[PDB]
Amino acid sequence: MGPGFDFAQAIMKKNTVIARTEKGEFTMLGVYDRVAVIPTHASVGEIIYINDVETRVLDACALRDLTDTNLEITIVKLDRNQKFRDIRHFLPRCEDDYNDAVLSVHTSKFPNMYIPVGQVTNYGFLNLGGTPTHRILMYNFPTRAGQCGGVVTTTGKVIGIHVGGNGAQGFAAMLLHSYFT
């Protein structure tokens, strides 16, 4: 509808796949090469379905900060026959707050879904499903089941992936350029 939704749509059309694990269907962001990200609660195994194609997982790493605290991001290398467009230059270098973000989801349940979530806070610490978690972004939208893995963008930046909510607020794990060197 405007330039925030334009950048979000460009990321969704070329840089997302539908990932299915034993824990459900997730929006999955491809970042570069055959490397993608998904929330750690997806419980990625040795095999994952990517747009309903059986796909070997070549590597999967659940990230933690140097406090040894959960970040809720898993980086997955996928045994695909195709690379993602390299979008690493749209990743923030630092922790920050943002205005006017969009959350975008694409699953069998929620295809072509875009939500203007507004102001994003560098929230930091969250007890997420009982697990101490760092680098959380927060927005004041009542996000629901089905939005985990959703991509959070501003104009020209891919800033996070949706990992949970409390009925009134939604929470995303930060994406940082340093995760993908």
Curated annotation (Swiss-Prot):
Location of the protein in the cell: Host cytoplasm
Q: What reaction does this catalyse?
A: Selective cleavage of Gln-|-Gly bond in the poliovirus polyprotein. In other picornavirus reactions Glu may be substituted for Gln, and Ser or Thr for Gly
Source domain of life: Viruses
Looking at the record, the residues that make up the Peptidase C3 domain are 2-180
Task: Report which residue ranges the record marks as coiled coil.
Answer: none
Catalytic residues, chain numbering = H41, E72, C148
Bilayer-spanning residue ranges: none
Q: What does this protein do?
A: Major viral protease that mediates proteolytic processing of the polyprotein. Cleaves host EIF5B, contributing to host translation shutoff. Also cleaves host PABPC1, contributing to host translation shutoff. Binds and inhibits host IFIH1/MDA5, thereby inhibiting the type-I IFN production and the establishment of the antiviral state. Cleaves host MAP3K7/TAK1, resulting in inhibition of TRAF6-triggered NF-kappa-B induction. Cleaves host TICAM1; this interaction allows the virus to disrupt host TLR3 signaling. Cleaves host IRF7, resulting in inhibition of type-I IFN production.
Oligomer status and interactors: Interacts with host IFIH1/MDA5; this interaction inhibits host IFIH1.
Name under which the protein is recorded: Protease 3C
| Organism encoding this protein | Human enterovirus D68 (EV68)
* Part of the full-length chain shown: 1549 to 1728 of 2188
